[PDB]
Each structure stands twice: as C-alpha cells, then as structure tokens.
Paper text:
The protein kinase Akt is a central signaling molecule within the PI3K/Akt/mTOR-pathway, and dysregulation and malfunction of this pathway is a major cause of human diseases such as cancer and diabetes. For the protein kinase Akt, three isoforms are encoded in the human genome sharing a high overall sequence homology, particularly within the conserved kinase and the pleckstrin homology (PH) domains. Recently, we utilized a class of covalent-allosteric Akt inhibitors (CAAIs) to achieve isoform-selectivity. These types of ligands alkylate one of two cysteine residues within an interdomain pocket between the regulatory PH and the catalytic kinase domain, leading to an irreversible stabilization of the inactive conformation bearing a structurally blocked ATP-binding site.
Author numbering: 4 to 44, 48 to 112, 144 to 186, 205 to 301, 308 to 444
The structure:
C-alpha cells in the first residue's frame, strides 16, 4: 500500500483548459492524485482518481508528449490529459500506470423505446429522453461510443444496460415531478423548512456515495436536481464530458474553489455544492455570479459569501460552513464527512433513518397523476 511513482506533470485543466504543473502520486492501490505542491503527507481512497479499468493513449496533439488516461466511471467517460517534457518520461509514466492497472486486475434493444427529445450531446455520445413503449415510462438513455471502451432512494437509478454494434446504452429513470430550477424560479424562494427537506435528502444521497461507493459526485448543482411524482429529490446522472467552448467547460458558478484550481480535492467538494444549492433555494439567487469569467473565478476564489437579512442564524451557520473556501475548514470536510452536516443545528430534529426511508412528507407535491403524467414535459406548462 505505497507509492509506485511520483513527480511533476503538466495536467490540462478540467474546466479551464490550461496547462498547469502538478505533483502527481501513483500508488499501488490505483490512485493517481495531483497536488499543487509536493505534499508532506481522506484516507478512504476515492474512485474518482483510480487508474483501475482505464486505457492509456499517447498522442502528439494538441501537444507533443501527451498521454491520456480514459476511464468509464459509472455511466460517464472521463479523460485526464497530461504532458511531460520528454518521450522517455511519458513512457515511464504510462508503463508504471499500466502496470498498476494490471496489478489491480485480480433481451432489450433500441426498438423497445421511442425517441422523444435530445437532452445533451458529448464528445463520446449523447443523452436522449425516451419512453419505454410497453410501460409508458420515461427514461434517460446514455448512448456512448463503444470504440471509446447500486441503489439509493434519491439517486436516479440505472435500470437497463445494453449494447449495439457500435454504441453502449445506459437506461436510467427520469423523474417526472419537474426540474428543481423550474420550481425554484416559479416560487422565487423556498422556505427554510422546504430547503431543509430537499437538503436533508441530498445529504442522505451524498453520504451513501461517499461511504458506500467512495465516490465524489462533484456535479451538485440546481440543474441536476429533480422531483419524482411524490415530491422527493432525484439527483441526476445525465452528464457527458464535452469538449470545452472557446476555452472553458460549462459554467463555473457552482464549482468548488479547489476544483477550479485543479488542486487536490475530496469529499468536501460535494458539501460546497450542497451549500451552493441550499444558498439559492433559501435566498433566491446564486451565491456568486458575474459575467466576466476573470471576475467569477475571483468571486468564487476570493469574495467572501454574503447573506440576506432574512436568513436565520442556523441557516447562515450552515451555509457559512458549507461554503468555506478552504476544504480542510469546510463543514463536512473532516473525517466525519456527512455526519458534520447531519449533526448541525440547522438539521436539529431530523431523524436521518426516516430520511433514507422517505418517511418525511414532501412539502410540495408535484401536480402529476402518476409516474407517466407528462405535465412537466408539456411545452405549454413549462413556459
Ligand atoms: C465541462 C464539461 C466536462 O467535461 N466536465 C467534466 C470533465 C471531466 C470530469 N471528470 C469527472 O470525474 N467528472 C465528473 C464525473 C461524473 N460526475 C457525475 C457523477 C458522479 C458519480 C456518479 C455515481 N457513481 C457511482 C454510483 C454507484 O456506484 C452512482 C452514481 C450516481 C448515480 C445516479 C445519480 C448520482 C450519482 C454519477 C455521476 C460529475 C462530473 C468530470 C466532468
């Protein structure tokens, strides 16, 4: 359980596509971690950084002496692009990485679904809204290029996985209670009670992913939250890695500081996201927002988060801890992880086993008759 290789690499930023020097550790457990400076040295390894079941590619574009680690994590293809000064070093890194990966080695068809809407396109495939002909139920289908290659109440479940000759297809449930940004904008702001409920269920799902699955979600934002027919949260998994837009990938309003800086990150990234999401629910606006990306980054990195006079002291305490710039200081960034949030005064009185078991009654019931009611898909209502 030790280091197989370490040294400086040039890593391309995941959201700001610039080259940055980072000190990377390769460990026999499969973790490939990069730090801004050489670390003096959470202990539970995170699969986000694992090299297990990845393929290594050597390329001379966009830059010479580049190598790429490509991994399928759950239903998303992930790439990490690195550059070294010499081809001899690139060969050292790839073989070392490859050896570690080798050491860790030890019907339904497309015709059953009706294509409805394109939800998103990515470098390695697309996501479409479909309806199973037999049931009338709605699903998101991730169609990924084959060439490139459990269950929780509040995560969108992966139901079917099947293949074509050139595509790999993941079929996951699509909640029909409406997008959470659609509900928040309609009602402007949520009461602290209502935000506590959605917040509680998110904490429950994040606790599962961190403890049981040892994975950081890293994508927690309002756009990835939906309500099912009963009004419970569903965190979505409809994402696909895209080439940036000239070059920044997506929008940064929700990104944790340590993620923006391409620095070492862990489970604390999701608590930031929780803070971003709960700040907007209870305040009616994003914490940091400015059109200049140079300013948005500074705002996220530098500007101290401000609160409205309407927020209670408990809510202000929770948001302040969640939105601490430094993850080591952030609420939930310690070894207790999710327990720090659960035991917070803002969640006093919440029985956390009742949360996992959907015992808490939703404060808002979406106006749908069943799991197949298409109200929140209808154009007339969505506007
Ligand atoms: C600018 C555009 C772009 O390209 N962004 C980008 C680039 C590189 C990335 N590398 C990166 O890891 N992510 C990130 C990679 C993907 N996460 C999203 C994610 C993270 C974990 C699971 C997940 N897992 C395991 C289990 C069970 O076992 C269950 C789930 C699950 C299921 C249902 C709902 C919720 C979670 C599912 C999605 C967040 C993003 C990257 C993103």
């Amino acid at each position: 359980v030790a280091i197989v290789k370490e040294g400086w690499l040039h890593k391309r930023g995941e959201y700001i596509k610039t080259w940055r020097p980072r000190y990377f550790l390769l460990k026999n457990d499969g973790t490939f971690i990069g730090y801004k400076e050489r670390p003096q040295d959470r202990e539970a390894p995170l699969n986000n950084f694992s090299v297990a079941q990845c393929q290594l590619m050597k390329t001379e574009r966009p830059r010479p002496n580049t190598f790429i680690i490509r991994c399928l994590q759950w239903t998303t293809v992930i790439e990490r692009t690195f550059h070294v000064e010499t081809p001899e070093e690139r060969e050292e890194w790839t073989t070392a990485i490859q050896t570690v990966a080798d050491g860790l080695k030890k019907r339904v068809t497309m015709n059953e679904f009706e294509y409805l809407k394109l939800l998103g396109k990515g470098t390695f495939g697309k996501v479409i809204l479909v309806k199973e002909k037999a049931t009338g139920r709605y699903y998101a289908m991730k169609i990924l290029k084959k060439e490139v290659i459990s269950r929780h109440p509040f995560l969108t479940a992966l139901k079917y996985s099947f293949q074509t000759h050139d595509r790999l297809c993941f079929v996951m449930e699509y909640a029909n209670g409406g997008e959470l940004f659609f509900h928040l904008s309609r009602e402007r702001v949520f009461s602290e009670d209502r935000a506590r409920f959605y917040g509680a269920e998110i904490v429950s799902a994040l606790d599962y992913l961190h403890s049981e699955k040892n994975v950081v979600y890293r994508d927690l934002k309002l756009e990835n939250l939906m309500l099912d027919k009963d009004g419970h949260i569903k965190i979505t998994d409809f994402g696909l890695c895209k080439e940036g837009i000239k070059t920044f990938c997506g929008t940064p309003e929700y990104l944790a500081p340590e993620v923006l800086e391409d620095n070492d990150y862990g489970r604390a990234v999701d608590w930031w996201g929780l803070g971003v999401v709960m700040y907007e629910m209870m305040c009616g606006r994003l914490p940091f927002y400015n059109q200049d990306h140079e300013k948005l980054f500074e705002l996220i990195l530098m500007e101290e988060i401000r609160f409205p006079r309407t927020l209670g002291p408990e809510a202000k305490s929770l948001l302040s801890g969640l939105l601490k710039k430094d993850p080591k200081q952030r609420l939930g960034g310690g070894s207790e992880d999710a327990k720090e949030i659960m035991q917070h005064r803002f969640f006093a009185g919440i029985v956390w086993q009742h949360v996992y078991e959907k015992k808490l009654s939703p404060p808002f019931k979406p106006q749908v008759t069943s799991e197949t009611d298409t109200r929140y898909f209808d154009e007339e209502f969505t506007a």
